[PDB]
From Swiss-Prot, chain A:
Protein name: Small ribosomal subunit protein uS9
Assigned protein family: Belongs to the universal ribosomal protein uS9 family.
UniProtKB/Swiss-Prot annotation, chain B:
Summary of the function given for this chain in its UniProt record: Located at the top of the head of the 30S subunit, it contacts several helices of the 16S rRNA. In the 70S ribosome it contacts the 23S rRNA (bridge B1a) and protein L5 of the 50S subunit (bridge B1b), connecting the 2 subunits; these bridges are implicated in subunit movement. Contacts the tRNAs in the A and P-sites.
Gene: rpsM
Gene Ontology BP terms: translation
Oligomer status and interactors: Part of the 30S ribosomal subunit. Forms a loose heterodimer with protein S19. Forms two bridges to the 50S subunit in the 70S ribosome.
Pfam family, one: Ribosomal_S13
Alphabetized InterPro entries for the sequence: Rbsml_uS13_C (IPR027437), Ribosomal_uS13 (IPR001892), Ribosomal_uS13-like_H2TH (IPR010979), Ribosomal_uS13_bac-type (IPR019980), Ribosomal_uS13_CS (IPR018269)
Comp. bias regions, Basic residues: 90-113
Protein name, entry field: Small ribosomal subunit protein uS13
A GO molecular function held by the record: tRNA binding
Gene Ontology CC entries for this record: cytosol; small ribosomal subunit
Region (Disordered): 90-118
Protein family: Belongs to the universal ribosomal protein uS13 family.
Curated annotation (Swiss-Prot), chain D:
Family of the protein in this entry: Belongs to the universal ribosomal protein uL5 family.
Function: This is one of the proteins that bind and probably mediate the attachment of the 5S RNA into the large ribosomal subunit, where it forms part of the central protuberance. In the 70S ribosome it contacts protein S13 of the 30S subunit (bridge B1b), connecting the 2 subunits; this bridge is implicated in subunit movement. Contacts the P site tRNA; the 5S rRNA and some of its associated proteins might help stabilize positioning of ribosome-bound tRNAs.
Classification via Gene3D superfamilies: 3.30.1440.10
Protein name as catalogued: Large ribosomal subunit protein uL5
InterPro entries linked to this entry: Ribosomal_uL5, Ribosomal_uL5_bac-type, Ribosomal_uL5_C, Ribosomal_uL5_CS, Ribosomal_uL5_dom_sf, Ribosomal_uL5_N
Keywords annotated in UniProt: Ribonucleoprotein, Ribosomal protein, RNA-binding, rRNA-binding, tRNA-binding
Molecular-function annotations in GO: rRNA binding; structural constituent of ribosome; tRNA binding
Entry's Gene Ontology cellular component terms: ribonucleoprotein complex; ribosome
HAMAP family documented for this protein: Ribosomal_uL5_B
Domain of life: Bacteria
One GO BP annotation of this record: translation
Subunit structure: Part of the 50S ribosomal subunit; part of the 5S rRNA/L5/L18/L25 subcomplex. Contacts the 5S rRNA and the P site tRNA. Forms a bridge to the 30S subunit in the 70S ribosome.
Swiss-Prot record, chain E:
Domain of life from the UniProt record: Bacteria
InterPro entries attached to this UniProt entry: Ribosomal_uS19, Ribosomal_uS19_bac-type, Ribosomal_uS19_CS, Ribosomal_uS19_SF
Primary role: Protein S19 forms a complex with S13 that binds strongly to the 16S ribosomal RNA.
GO cellular component: cytoplasm; small ribosomal subunit
Family affiliation: Belongs to the universal ribosomal protein uS19 family.
Record keyword Ribosomal protein present: yes
Record keywords: Ribonucleoprotein, Ribosomal protein, RNA-binding, rRNA-binding
Organism for this UniProt entry: Mycoplasma pneumoniae (strain ATCC 29342 / M129 / Subtype 1) (Mycoplasmoides pneumoniae)
GO biological process, one term: translation
GO MF, any single term: structural constituent of ribosome
HAMAP family: Ribosomal_uS19
Official protein name in the record: Small ribosomal subunit protein uS19
A family per Pfam: Ribosomal_S19
Length: 65, 118, 44, 175, 84
RNA sequence: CAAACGUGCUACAAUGGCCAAUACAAACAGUCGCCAGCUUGUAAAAGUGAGCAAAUCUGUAAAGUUGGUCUCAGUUCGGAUUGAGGGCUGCAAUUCGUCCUCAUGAAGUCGGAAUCACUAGUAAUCGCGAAUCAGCUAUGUCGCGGUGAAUACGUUCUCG
């Protein structure tokens, strides 16, 4: 395994996908257990773009009344 | 100086409770003494103590520092200068937000009502 | 009744000379940081 | 103690200094009084047993307290309720106290610059103001309700200040 | 001074100081600039420093020269607290 | 400036400080700007002098990891008012710059009635980039990426 960029957990997920993809191409019946355990490819789980006027991604400063 | 420092601690922190000497200067003075500090050692001999007194007297002890600073404040306050006038009224001198946030010398916490409307 | 207090040795703590003065007799040969004859404020 | 040294040297140069040609008209030491001046023992405080034991250790003789000479209306003090201490010193104990103080207490002060401009009665008796509890080599580590000094005074035979100051200089008390 | 204008003075008021340093030190001289830092040559005269309303006359003492002229001229009034 | 509302940073700490070594990012910017390395300077920062009209070069990741280290104090956590000595910037550093060194180490133990943000790299957060200039306690503002949750029974009540 050789990685470029990203945090250790992100690199861990990258090598997760690499290992599983190489296993799948190695022998087709591996696909089956991938559907058995449902541990599969990317969950498109990435940092969303924070917006203007928000100190975070879903954070407003606070609402005065 | 020469006061019985609290026991049960390392020498580095032992040379901190004395007024005028903090952390880095304590490290420098300890290294000048060459005590070779170990864990939770307080008293081992007196030949170290004499060197400590000599090097401390080479620097300025708490008492003389207090006298000199009091004299400097007196001199800056007894001459025409905004710093002395500011210090005489018990307000910060170096320049900070003086609008509503200065309550380190401006009384612990006291307040008065503003004018009422409606 | 008066409790007896007798001489305690004091000869070398920060200088080489001192006078034998009496103190509490429950201990002997106690050391002090500085005495009169080696006090920088005493002479200088 | 130093009485042998006092008669050894100091008396003769004291005679030589001022033209009197008498061995005893020079100033002499009589007594030293130790007073505590307790004003904090109004309620259930340490009631001087800390002070009692430390003063009895620094001077083996029994310290004696004193009661109020009048009735002060700002407290519950009405001619009684003994306060302070009374220790009179003479004999070997002049020097026993004097060397202990001069060579064990004054250099032991946290910071001492000396003070002697006028501490006399106009007749040559010098009061000494103790600052901290710990100026004696021995002390019981129990804490007095208020950390204080001790009242001590040196008395001289002559009713003049110059000769008393000369004697004190001969005894080398810092000025 | 750091010799790198860390204690810089415009030094154009100093010309009048050199002028007045040879005429037996007569008291009245017109001088006002908050940009100037004082020197031992200055003491012994008056400064009509500009606070913002009028040229207030001040006499710098003979105890120090370290700080600046503009520091020695009070401008802000006293609060005179009015609790309504 | 006698005060109060706020909107925030940072503390009330052993879900840590301190001492050292040690990784893991991206995006953006850069020719009197990034400044490499070196002489250094306690360090600030000065100086010497490469490279970069830039996927070549410069912007050094931080939390994290290995060893200690302090053992429940209003402390060694925390730091601002306060004094001196210096540094940069700009012709200018008193009001009214910031940086370093020594000191200064108070107050503050989870903050009252009430209140705000959010269904996943989201809050929690951890360091960096940049419009702003010569510089700027902007503890701001537009973003980058690092670790990483908990919960969702249903709309009686509560609000829109």
């Amino acid at each position: 395994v050789v990685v470029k960029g990203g945090g250790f957990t992100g690199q861990a997920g990258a090598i997760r996908l690499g290992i599983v993809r190489a296993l799948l191409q190695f022998n087709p019946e591996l696909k089956k257990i991938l559907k058995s355990k449902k541990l599969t490819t990317r969950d498109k789980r990435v940092k969303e773009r924070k917006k203007f006027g928000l100190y975070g991604a879903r954070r407003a400063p606070q609402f005065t009344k | 100086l020469g006061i019985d420092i609290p026991n049960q601690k390392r020498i580095e922190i032992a040379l901190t409770y004395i007024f005028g000497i903090g952390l880095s200067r304590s490290q420098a003075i300890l290294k000048q003494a060459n005590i070779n500090p170990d864990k939770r050692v307080k008293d081992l001999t007196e030949e170290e103590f004499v060197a400590i007194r000599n090097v401390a007297s080479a620097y300025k002890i708490e008492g003389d520092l207090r006298r000199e600073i009091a004299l400097n404040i007196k001199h800056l306050s007894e001459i025409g200068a905004w710093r002395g006038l500011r210090h005489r009224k018990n307000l910060p001198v170096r320049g900070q937000r003086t609008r509503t946030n200065a309550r380190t010398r401006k009384g612990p916490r006291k307040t008065v009502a503003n004018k009422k409307i409606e | 009744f008066h409790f007896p207090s007798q001489s305690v040795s004091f000869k070398c703590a920060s200088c080489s000379n001192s006078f034998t003065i009496e103190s509490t007799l429950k201990q002997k040969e106690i050391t002090i940081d500085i005495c009169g004859k080696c006090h920088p404020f005493y002479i200088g | 103690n130093l009485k042998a040294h006092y008669q050894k040297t100091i008396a003769k140069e004291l005679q030589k200094s001022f033209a009197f040609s008498s061995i005893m008209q020079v100033p002499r030491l009589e007594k030293i009084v130790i007073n505590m001046g307790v004003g904090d023992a109004i309620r259930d405080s340490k009631f001087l047993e800390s002070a009692l034991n430390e003063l009895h250790l620094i001077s083996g003789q029994k310290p004696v307290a004193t009661k109020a000479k009048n009735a002060i209306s700002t407290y519950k003090l009405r001619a009684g309720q003994l306060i302070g201490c009374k220790v009179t010193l003479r004999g070997e104990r002049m020097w026993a106290f004097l060397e202990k103080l001069i060579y064990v207490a004054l250099p032991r002060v946290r910071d001492f610059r000396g003070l002697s401009l006028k501490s006399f009665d106009g007749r040559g008796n010098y009061t000494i103001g103790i600052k901290e509890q710990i100026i004696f080599p021995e002390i019981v580590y129990d804490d007095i309700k208020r950390i204080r000094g001790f009242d001590v005074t040196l008395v001289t035979s002559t009713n003049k200040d110059s000769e008393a100051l000369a004697l004190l200089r001969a005894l080398n008390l810092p000025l | 001074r750091s010799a790198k204008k860390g204690a810089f003075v415009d030094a154009h008021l100093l010309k009048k100081v050199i002028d007045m340093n040879k005429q037996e030190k007569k008291r009245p001289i017109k001088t006002w600039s908050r940009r100037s830092t004082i020197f031992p040559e200055f003491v012994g005269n008056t400064f009509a420093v500009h606070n913002g309303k009028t040229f207030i006359n001040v006499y710098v003492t003979d105890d120090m020269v370290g700080h600046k002229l503009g520091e020695f001229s009070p401008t802000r009034n006293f609060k005179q607290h009015t609790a309504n």
